[PDB]
Design brief:
The protein has about 55 residues and is of the alpha+beta class. The chain has a single domain, classed as Ubiquitin-like (UB roll), CATH 3.10.20. It is about 25% helix and about 45% strand. It has a four-stranded mixed beta sheet with strand order 2-1-4-3, with helices on one face. It is found in: Secreted, Cell wall. This is Immunoglobulin G-binding protein G. It comes from Streptococcus sp. group G. It is classed as immune system.
Length: about 55
């Protein structure tokens, strides 16, 4: 499944995507991505749209 990450950061804002077999695998990839880019926010996940959102 294609999962989407919506980033609402202080300085970095946009969207990116990743492909994974399940949501937990996608979450790990996105949490690594956020750490690599210096984003430290709160997360939500909406199973209906397969979208994660992170806000600083």
């Amino acid at each position: 499944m294609q999962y989407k990450l919506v980033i609402n950061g202080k300085t970095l804002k946009g969207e990116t995507t990743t492909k994974a077999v399940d949501a937990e695998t996608a979450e790990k990839a996105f949490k690594q991505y956020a750490n690599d880019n210096g984003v430290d926010g709160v997360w939500t996940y909406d199973d209906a749209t397969k979208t994660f959102t992170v806000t600083e």
